[PDB]
Scaffold this active site. Structure first.
Site, PDB file in Angstrom:
ATOM      1  N   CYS A  29       0.857  -1.174   0.000  1.00 47.45           N
ATOM      2  CA  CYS A  29       0.000   0.000   0.000  1.00 47.45           C
ATOM      3  C   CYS A  29       0.902   1.236   0.000  1.00 47.45           C
ATOM      4  O   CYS A  29       1.664   1.446   0.946  1.00 47.45           O
ATOM      5  CB  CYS A  29      -0.923  -0.056   1.224  1.00 47.45           C
ATOM      6  SG  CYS A  29      -2.071   1.351   1.206  1.00 47.45           S
ATOM      7  N   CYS A  32       0.564   3.719   3.097  1.00 54.48           N
ATOM      8  CA  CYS A  32       1.229   3.217   4.306  1.00 54.48           C
ATOM      9  C   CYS A  32       2.696   3.656   4.368  1.00 54.48           C
ATOM     10  O   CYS A  32       3.209   3.970   5.443  1.00 54.48           O
ATOM     11  CB  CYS A  32       1.183   1.683   4.365  1.00 54.48           C
ATOM     12  SG  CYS A  32      -0.503   1.075   4.626  1.00 54.48           S
TER      13      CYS A  32
END
Length: 104
Positions: A29, A32
């Site tokens: 991700c 993140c």
């Protein structure tokens, strides 16, 4: 000071000692990784007043499910063993430190 790491095995112990922010994340991700330096800013600025715990949703799938989390980045705030806040997506430093200082 330094950010901590946990899974289902020890997240409950780690969150039961003080103000503890957590970051439910995964490495695939983008956001993140984008929030990672912002969490390091919080670790520099407040990472003694509070603890920060990285926790990976593939590894703590049960524990993330304990809060209905199966999406990332998802920040949690816990205090002396219980969840007190939850937030999703990237945040800028100023908003994140405002959010944190409100629960110190």
């Amino acid at each position: 000071m330094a950010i901590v790491k946990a899974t289902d095995q020890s997240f409950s112990a780690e969150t039961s000692e003080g103000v503890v922010l957590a970051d439910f994340w995964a490495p695939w991700c983008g956001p993140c990784k984008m929030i990672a330096p912002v969490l390091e800013e919080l670790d520099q600025e407040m990472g003694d007043k509070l603890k920060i715990v990285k926790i990976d949703v593939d590894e703590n799938q049960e524990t993330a499910g304990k809060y209905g989390v199966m999406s990332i980045p998802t920040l949690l705030v816990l205090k002396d063993g219980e969840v007190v806040e939850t937030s999703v997506g990237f945040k800028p430093k100023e908003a994140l430190q405002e959010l944190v200082n409100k629960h110190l």
